[PDB]
Design a protein around this ligand. Structure first.
Ligand SMILES: Nc1ncnc2c1ncn2[C@@H]1O[C@H](COP(=O)(O)OP(=O)(O)O)[C@@H](O)[C@H]1O
Ligand SMILES: Nc1ncnc2c1ncn2[C@@H]1O[C@H](COP(=O)(O)OP(=O)(O)O)[C@@H](O)[C@H]1O
Ligand SMILES: [Mg+2]
Ligand SMILES: [Mg+2]
Lengths: 203, 220, 203, 220
């Protein structure tokens, strides 16, 4: 009995899961938009913190400056923790809804003798795609926000007789953002799907 | 034998008991009807056979391998051997007939060409080859039931379990479905049918009849 | 045939829908947490902007301060709009999942001859309770953030000897926050539930 | 009459046609069986009666009021008159029997005391009063079907439609269910039964029999 290879089945699963996301446009576009905005917010907060820190470094007085940096770091970290926690939960809800949508298919698949891993892999890849697309959209949104802010910043820089310019996310930071997005999209999917799939019976 | 029971019994959570000291033996190639009343324990017996629900008292042997305490990870390998036909002709309305009949062959990864040829052979055997590309909705009830039987049998199962396949068909199509099952039995597939229609079983006395009355099996 | 009064049925529906949220703790606690954080960001940002503006008012210097205020207002508005949109979108998903969970009940209810309004009102009140609880949770989150930040602000002020402390949200503002929360919880629920209810058939 | 058809016909989206020039009249108090084949159009005829699906050619009159183009907002008022019993004995497993039987009385707001007394009377009539507080799961199949019938009839419907109520019961309980339906008919409730079991209809020749063959109704 001819059997497909490991990488062949994995690539087929990835392509099929990407195709499946567009079965329900309304159901899966809103979640992508929400993830994009939620992940973009902390990116913009970090961007502003980085810009102000660069300004401060570029410029009794020294002792007071460090405390302001500490306060800014605490605020940014708190908001980042909130938003990252938010992204984790929303992904789980969408996958739980998807699993409940495919109740009959999973029932029939389990009845015929399919292993749990076969049932589970498509949802892992769907979560990974959610994370990746959300990260890309968040990066685009942060770029647009920087473009928007530059106009206001120019007036302040001109009035101060300065040549200050906003600096966008570094190319090394974009890789970290994408890694975080896919990490959430995978971990939330695994945890929620594994915990929820157990409580579904073949009949 | 293909399936055996040793003083197996089951009691539900509420305390009502479906099966009590039911014992029977099934040899490869034989066919049984498993007649019973509206209540009794016909469906439960079928669930116990394929390990959907575990027993309490006795032990179950599939091919000399104990299924009494099969670990949950090894259940799929057992279920792959057993094909099941249900009264509701469970089908996926979204997908095509060819996709439904090919699901068991895709659960275990197989080359698409072999899947195509095997599904074509199965549908030719059941006479639905012509409508292989059509949706289940356009089919009639009997055609949907035949598609379900084909999907059950596509994977060369050693034992075929049918839970009242002819529930939603008039007597005219009952004969056709039962003759299809008899053809499969001639092919060499062990079949254990389950029905409460006394007329149908009384029609054909060749096959051994097991009567399940209030959880007890006379086997006569 | 005795029939219940309008206010009686509405009150009973509100009470029963509130009781319904506790059917699924994991299903409906995560959404409340996400809404709380999302609606908390706007309030906390407004709090920070208000505090810095009050400090500036307390304090050539006139010209640049107006530009700084303009930049702060732009940043706050842009970052708050995203969270308002996210709260609007996320509420719809939870109610869509709930409606798909009650598929059989709605089928039987429509088959027996129930009007659409009877089917729909429980979801409206569930959305309203979502909004109200989210607003309350966001208010508490902002208060807790103020409590956390006050210690660091005091540590910073000791060096400056400013003797300045943060001040929490005003009572009038809290009413507006609750109104916004309930407004979103009602509007998103109405839109999503009404659009989705059409495509469920009795059999 | 309680329901009438004038040259009504229906064609599905695919082009297959369920009903062609079917015409019959039903007087208040009479009972009909509506026999047909495994295919034919028995379920569709029942769907058309209660406006789940609209017709194409003819017109439908419930009590002299045209139902051919009833606006979607007035459908619930019509459905309140008609009670429906299905083969699957659709019940809410989560809720109790008393809650399931009281759903039609809560769809339209009614005082709880009247709901209690009416549900108690209905369950007493069907003999399930004792188990009113139990869950559907603990009941047997026949008890679940009787609960479904009670829920259908609790609202004093003028016309009762049953779509193969005895699909999942052996002949022994078929007689009991049919006698319950006959009692309801004696009460004065018009009933239009639907089944393909020729034996059951041939058992009782008092009630007029309508045969639906390939979408045509001989009415003999
Ligand atoms: N999930 C369950 N919970 C409680 N009792 C059950 C359950 N399933 C079956 N029973 C009861 O135990 C026996 C098994 O039912 P079953 O054998 O499936 O009847 P049938 O042969 O008509 O399908 C019956 O008495 C039934 O009422
Ligand atoms: N939703 C549908 N789409 C396409 N064809 C249908 C649909 N429903 C019924 N049909 C076909 O039209 C006729 C109506 O089916 P039906 O009267 O329900 O059979 P039964 O009496 O056994 O329930 C049959 O030929 C059936 O195959
Ligand atoms: Mg059964
Ligand atoms: Mg039918």
């Amino acid at each position: 009995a001819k059997t497909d290879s490991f990488l062949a089945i994995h690539f087929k699963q990835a392509k099929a899961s990407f195709a499946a996301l567009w079965r329900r446009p309304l159901g899966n576009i809103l979640t992508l938009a929400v993830i994009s905005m939620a992940l973009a917010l902390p990116a913009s907060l970090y961007l502003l913190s980085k810009n102000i820190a660069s300004v401060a470094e570029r410029v009794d007085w020294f002792a007071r400056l460090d405390a302001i940096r500490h306060l800014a770091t605490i605020v940014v970290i708190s908001l980042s923790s909130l938003m990252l926690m938010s992204v984790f939960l929303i992904v789980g809800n969408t996958l739980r809804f998807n699993v409940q949508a495919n109740k009959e298919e999973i029932q029939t698949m389990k009845l015929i003798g399919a292993t749990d891993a076969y049932i589970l892999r498509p949802y892992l890849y769907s979560g990974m795609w959610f994370g990746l697309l959300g990260a890309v959209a968040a990066w685009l949104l942060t770029a647009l926000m920087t473009i928007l802010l530059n106009g206001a910043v120019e007036a302040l820089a001109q009035l101060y007789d300065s040549r200050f310019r906003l600096i966008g996310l570094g190319w090394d930071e974009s890789l970290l953002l994408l890694m975080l997005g896919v990490f959430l999209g995978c971990v939330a999917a695994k945890v929620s799907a594994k915990r929820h799939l157990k409580e579904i019976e073949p009949v | 034998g293909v399936i055996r029971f040793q003083q197996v019994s089951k009691a539900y959570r509420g305390g009502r008991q479906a099966l009590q000291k039911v014992d029977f033996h099934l040899r490869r190639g034989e066919m049984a009807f498993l007649g019973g009343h509206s209540g009794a324990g016909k469906s439960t017996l079928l669930k116990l056979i394929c390990a959907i629900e575990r027993p309490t008292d006795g032990k179950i042997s599939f091919n000399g391998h104990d299924i009494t305490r099969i670990p949950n990870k090894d259940i799929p390998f057992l279920r792959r051997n057993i094909g099941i036909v249900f009264q509701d002709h469970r089908l996926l309305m979204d997908r095509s007939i060819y996709d439904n009949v090919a699901l068991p062959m895709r659960i275990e990864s197989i080359s698409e060409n072999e899947i195509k040829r095997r599904v074509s052979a199965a549908l030719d055997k059941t006479g639905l080859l012509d409508k292989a590309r059509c949706l289940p909705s356009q089919l009639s009830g009997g055609e949907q039931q035949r598609v379900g039987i084909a999907r059950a049998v596509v994977n060369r199962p050693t034992l075929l379990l049918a839970d009242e396949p002819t529930g939603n068909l008039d007597p005219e199509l009952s004969s056709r479905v039962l003759r299809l099952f008899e053809e499969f039995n001639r092919a060499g597939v062990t079949i254990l049918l389950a029905t409460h229609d006394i007329h149908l079983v009384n029609s054909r006395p060749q096959y051994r009849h097991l009567e399940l009355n209030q959880g007890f099996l006379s086997e006569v």
